[PDB]
């Protein structure tokens with residue numbers, strides 16, 4: 001695969017200090033993961049950046065998905081187009097711990113990754129949703145069995161994560 005410069009964490013999990021949008025643009029992976037909310041309203045963080053890079057096509061598609069199917073579940077997912085970034089985007093909803101949602105649902109969220117052989121992904125719930133980032137990384141490592149390439153935008157966070165036990 002064309003993923004380059006990743007640090008190996010485990011047999012199947014790799015990590016890099018990179019913007020997921022730039023990784024997706026360069027690699028054009030089969031699957032890029034979005035850290036979504038249940039309404040697929042891609043406002044900020046990973047979702048807002050991915051959507052911006054698609055010139056809002058991701059949001060237009062997402063609005064039709066919701067109109068047809070209704071909100072996702074917390075811990076749930078749907079497969080939509082990856083537009084100009086990837087073949088597919090797997091939109092995954094981690095728990096919004098800052099709004100009282102159960103952190104246990106982070107494991108359910110990462111289980112969705114096992115339906116795909118290779119993914120480029122962020123650390124779910126670790127941003128605006130308020131989960132401890134090292135916890136999200138540990139849940140990823142302990143849940144995902146398929147090959148995951150994690151893109152960590154924030155340099156300070158990356159440096160801390162790669163120096164922490166799993």
Ligand SMILES: Nc1ncnc2c1ncn2[C@@H]1O[C@H](COP(=O)(O)OP(=O)(O)OC[C@H]2O[C@H](O)[C@H](O)[C@@H]2O)[C@@H](O)[C@H]1O
Nearest residue numbers: 019020035037042043044045046047125126127128129153
């Ligand atoms: N471009 C990026 N590339 C890689 N990692 C990033 C990027 N931007 C942020 N991160 C990191 O990615 C991690 C996740 O941060 P978040 O994207 O907030 O996701 P969540 O699951 O916590 O919140 C979901 C909400 O965020 C959106 O508003 C949605 O629309 C949802 O409403 C953090 O470590 C970030 O530093």
